[PDB]
Amino acid sequence: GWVKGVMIRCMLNIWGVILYLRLPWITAQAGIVLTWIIILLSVTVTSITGLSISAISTNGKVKSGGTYFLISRSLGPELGGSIGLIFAFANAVGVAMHTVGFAETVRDLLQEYGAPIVDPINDIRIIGVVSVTVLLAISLAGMEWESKAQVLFFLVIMVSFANYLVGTLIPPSEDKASKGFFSYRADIFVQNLVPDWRGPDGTFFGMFSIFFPSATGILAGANISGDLKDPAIAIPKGTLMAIFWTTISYLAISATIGSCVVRDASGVLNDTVTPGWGACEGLACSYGWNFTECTQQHSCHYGLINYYQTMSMVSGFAPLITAGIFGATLSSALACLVSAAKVFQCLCEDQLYPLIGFFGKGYGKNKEPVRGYLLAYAIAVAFIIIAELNTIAPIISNFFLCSYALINFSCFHASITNSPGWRPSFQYYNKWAALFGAIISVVIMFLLTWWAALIAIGVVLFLLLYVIYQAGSYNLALSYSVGLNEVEDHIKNYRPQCLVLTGPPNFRPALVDFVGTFTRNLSLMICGHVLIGPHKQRMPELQLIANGHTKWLNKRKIKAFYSDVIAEDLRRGVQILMQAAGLGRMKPNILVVGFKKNWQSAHPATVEDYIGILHDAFDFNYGVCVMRMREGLNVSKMMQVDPKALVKEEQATTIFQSEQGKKTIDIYWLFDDGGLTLLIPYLLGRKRRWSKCKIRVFVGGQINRMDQERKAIISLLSKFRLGFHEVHILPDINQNPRAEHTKRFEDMIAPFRLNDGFKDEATVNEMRRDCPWKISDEEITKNRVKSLRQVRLNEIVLDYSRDAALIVITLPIGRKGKCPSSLYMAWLETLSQDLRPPVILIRGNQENVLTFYC
Amino acid sequence: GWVKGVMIRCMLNIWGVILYLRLPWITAQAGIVLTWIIILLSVTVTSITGLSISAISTNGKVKSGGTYFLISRSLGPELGGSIGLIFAFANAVGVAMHTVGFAETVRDLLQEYGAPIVDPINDIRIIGVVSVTVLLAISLAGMEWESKAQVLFFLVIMVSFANYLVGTLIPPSEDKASKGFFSYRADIFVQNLVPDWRGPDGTFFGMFSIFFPSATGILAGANISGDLKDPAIAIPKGTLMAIFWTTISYLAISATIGSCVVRDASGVLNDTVTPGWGACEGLACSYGWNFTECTQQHSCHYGLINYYQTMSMVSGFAPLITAGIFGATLSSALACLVSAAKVFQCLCEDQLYPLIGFFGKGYGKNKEPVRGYLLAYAIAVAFIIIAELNTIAPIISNFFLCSYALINFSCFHASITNSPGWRPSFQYYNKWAALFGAIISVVIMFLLTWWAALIAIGVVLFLLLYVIYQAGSYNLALSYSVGLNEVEDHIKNYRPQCLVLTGPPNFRPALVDFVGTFTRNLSLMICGHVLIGPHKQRMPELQLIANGHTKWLNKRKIKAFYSDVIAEDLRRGVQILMQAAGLGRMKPNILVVGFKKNWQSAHPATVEDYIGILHDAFDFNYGVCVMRMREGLNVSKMMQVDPKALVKEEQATTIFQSEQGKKTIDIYWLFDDGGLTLLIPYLLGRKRRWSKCKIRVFVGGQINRMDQERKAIISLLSKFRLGFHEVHILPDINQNPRAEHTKRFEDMIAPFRLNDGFKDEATVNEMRRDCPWKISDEEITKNRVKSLRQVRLNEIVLDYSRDAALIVITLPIGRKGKCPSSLYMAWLETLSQDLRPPVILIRGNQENVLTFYC
């Protein structure tokens, strides 16, 4: 339920050692008014944190429970992981504080009854170590008696409170009056209403740092959210009621102990007032006691400000309050230890931090964090070695204030940024109240001591930034794609979607880098390897080889999407890839095909396949490009870096980027239909390294007009962001070429004079003028026109461009049925046959433009 | 250039009041060693910040930009705005500091002539406010000549340094020796090597806070940008050289003033030691000077630790050092004043903060920040009212340390997160050096004083958090989906990428719906429509058809991509789309096929093509699935105005489409592997529609042991939440053969014997064995028992699951070369016979299981 399950659990964890041992002393040094102010200032922070905790408990629905699990699932991995670690450390030090208080009580019992062990501080150390070892032994094995222990502890604390209140009303005896107790008196109340400020810790915030661990423990209700009936209505009321009732108890005890005991008293029973004309100085003189001797010399042993166990002295039966101290300290220490271990284990099971993951495994059948229990025990022992409560308490105040500020600010952050899963139903949660609580918690943390607060904030920032440096990554790409399913065919975004042939990626990598240069974070570039084996498709050995190849490619920091194809020949192999690659609107639009360095050496029939590539690409309304670099195409000389992944020379391509380019692109327009002609040069022409480029826009501009035909391209020039009027009119585009060049063009096809790959087509010629080698207006009979033109282009490139870093060569057009594949190949070969420049071939598909950069 | 452009004006801003007024006093209170440590510790912070600033300057080619512009464009707006605000405030307070130093110098000058105004402190206030008003008047109008005033200031400071050194070289005069300066002496150097803390400000960090303004002024090099020939080379050299040379000057002045002036001296010229025995003490006694009275009485007026103007006294010509102080102060204060105003104006140009202060508005033709100038003047006057360098300097140290820590951490943040616009070219920039600089800056800021450091940090946090609080996806894909291309392969999450073959999307819409409600933002679903085109694409209008189908899909709630493949048949027709659909990881993983229910009407070729897709899916590691309906998946759409969404009638046939599933789904998963067999109804179950259907597990096979295998299944069920433990036994497959069910099958496979139309099979078979059911290790003989099992599965569909949402039977498996096509197709027809509700068959590729949803 909510009473015993939640409120009593929070009660037993909030009530602890400072309630019995230091609250009367805080009331003595700070007075009743400032002690109440301290109590209320701590309760403000803890109640604002409790409202955030209640909002967390009402957010969504969590069935397993746990403080770290609730906070992290409601607030996030970064803030949740910082909270689950600072809170775990704070709970580990709380064990040390409560065990030190229990050890101090046992030491006082030994001093009054019997003999001490070694030394009043060393006895505290020894008893604390032994008691924390016993607590660890109980936690590891023997955690089934917890309901009975909870009932016994709550009843013993109730009995201690009742006995203290009963003995306070009793009129003082000789011993109690000697020790400073005079029942209730207005004079003592008025005297103790004001501070005294003795010792090094006499300070308002010095007292706040010692009292504050009396207000912590409000997170015990959230620890068992899974093991409750209805957490959304049980955790808030239980936590808030526990905070309220413990606040009432602290205020009442402070008020009644301030009004009963004087600050200074001496245990000597002879200090009763002598019947004569004495010089009695203190307030106790009116009550018949003479405490001047020690009060003037600051050597009193008893009193509110000098005796730490005055609460037990005041009461009717000291052993009952001793049992109450034992119960409170043991319950709080056990709760802190088990909470630290369980939060740390759950935090470690979520791999958010590198090295803590070792303390994440459980033992036995219920998976107890034995490693976490041992780490918490080690931290507790280390802080127990400090045998002073007034030293441990400020540390716990700092770390619990840091944890509460973190929780409050995490709730405020989740509220202000409208976090997805952050939907609190708690009626009394306000994000500005949480922000105020976090701010005041940090301010108080720095006010108690600045260096420990700085260390805590530094650790918090380290963890938060480490984590920063059910979201999912696959579903996001899917969501963006389907959102694009509603993309507008309107303003067709003719991004340079391209399809690339490389075969194995380690071979022909010049294309890879090339189409990798541009469309970097601009569009899609798809690599394409076609396996040419028609028999035994390596279904098993396809993903693995791709993996390896993609890793190599990825090691090159490329931006592509390799693709594997099985087929019998090149033609149908790429035909499969072009019309089915991508998905929906996410489809490739441009094809680039690697040239075969050795085509005329042997294997004649491959000309058909290679030219069918281009013809089917033309018919498919794709973009088309050829690939032939300075050096040989296929890498077959290795047996004497090699993996571009390791090292990628790619000089032929890297020249443009690695080296600062001083020579420019040269294009032309003999085929005006090609719109891409102003895009592929645009794309590549606009890259970081490609920055250095004095764009030479060579175009067949109108021989008389440079302002409406050439500027027709200049008005459009703006969108292509060209900014160049370099329209170099070279009307010598197709002038009669060199005699020698035509000669070579011919005997090039002399071996292939026949349509060897076209017997069928020869029969067609046979029935049509029987043209064996010369073809009317198709080969050289009349088609020579285009051949002499293209060769003139070659002369041009070789004369004007001469040494040309790169050339935008427009692939010429041949329509099937009026020109053979042979001549087409012949044209491809003669595009750059004389030498070996880098073939930056290009041609478009009469598609619209001005997509990139307007 | 770089010298005069950067380093000369960085020195002029770094040199200021503390160089002449408090450095000797710091060397007096702290030791020479401790003063050197302070200087080097400040220079470490400023040099790390200078490295960060040099990295910022060499980032990109930002032109015509101040300090704030550079920082906010290289770094983020969130960090840039806070940096600009803190830097502007720090400069505004530095104006007050340098004006107070100038006023102190003028007040001392007035006192030495015996003409004070009102009193020491109020005279400082009056002179400082008048000076700062004159400074504001110069800054507003009359700055045109500040370009030539720079040379005068630099030459004046150089002359002051030379005069100080020359005067230090001079042997003592009677007046100078009386005032404490004798000369370079080893004894004085040794005496001043050790610290001597002699006031409220006497502490290591107390002197660090006063000195540190001597090291600030390096960002003065940053705001020059736009007036430099080459910032990427000028800014780093100038800034670092200025830091080095000013550090050298500070160290030299400290070590030379600590070696010639004693800490205690009296301006009385009669202290000269009187001859006789005496009891004279002190180091000066050895030089004939008995300063005993003041030293013991602590009433000395002169000396290093008492006189604030010791550089002036030591130097040969006092007015020259006064001129040097004037030049240094009026250069640093003017630089700070015209830096704070410009940074604030640029910051207010960016609508980054709500209360702009409107100081952003420029005046005149140069758009000078008159409003910003007045705000800076007001802040300077407010901090001038303090009129004490030892109090103003700690504030400026705090705020400049905050600014430098902010810059260093912002550079580190940009480096570690790999910001898109952060690619610094500075060779000596390291993000860990920047992190160290920011951390030590914050530590020193809190060490000097904690409350002002907390105020500055809170202001920075407030600003930062306030600022913190169409082929787009195409492009977004580049960063996410090609970021999805790089993802590990060891994730092995069996993404249920699904492929479908409904032909036209409108037709066979039931499969579309089924594959759409499932994978609704979970898995990729791709719609493949085959146009079986045997010629040139009919028209681009086909693309219109594509947009019409995508609109149809969007007219409902589908997340489909539409693609098409041109072919001449179906087997190859799907085969094209099969191994090329998708791209990289996103690629479809399983395949569903529109069942050609009509199979006894058309030639069996269609049936052979049909078995083709399933066999190919078996060879390509794909998943096979198939639906079936009573009225017709390939419903004739018989026809037996604004027609509304046919969804209503459609969903009648497609419950999943809209109707929340009510009746139970049953997985007749005779086959175990191919997890999708269960996954399909599973992520179908996740669906709210199917949340109303107990997921029935109809396992079948062995009867002797049931749960023995199940315990493996319930382990993977703990992983794949089921919520049930009752798997109904299907012993029908065995010992339960029903004759009338065999007779139908036989009468259902007649024209299907050797109807594969496989002439080669017939031939090879004919030369092996004759009869169409003789050579039957494959022909419905060895696998006949399988046909019995199939018809029994249908019978237990009619009994065990008489009614169900979808009867999920495991899709059968047939071996190529060991299972004929007609036998398999008849098996499927039995498994999905008539008079059944929607029915689905599945069989995965047994890659791995449990990968999804644990």
Residue numbers in the entry:
A (entry chain A), B (entry chain B): 137 to 605, 617 to 787, 807 to 1020
Text taken from the publication that reported this structure:
The sodium-chloride cotransporter NCC mediates the coupled import of sodium and chloride across the plasma membrane, playing vital roles in kidney extracellular fluid volume and blood pressure control. NCC, encoded by the SLC12A3 gene, is expressed in the distal convoluted tubule in the kidney, responsible for sodium reabsorption and playing a pivotal role in extracellular fluid volume and blood pressure control.
Here, we present the full-length structure of human NCC, with 2.9 Å for the transmembrane domain and 3.8 Å for the carboxyl-terminal domain. NCC adopts an inward-open conformation and a domain-swap dimeric assembly. Like other wild-type (WT) CCCs, our NCC structure is also trapped in an inward-open conformation occluded with substrate ions.
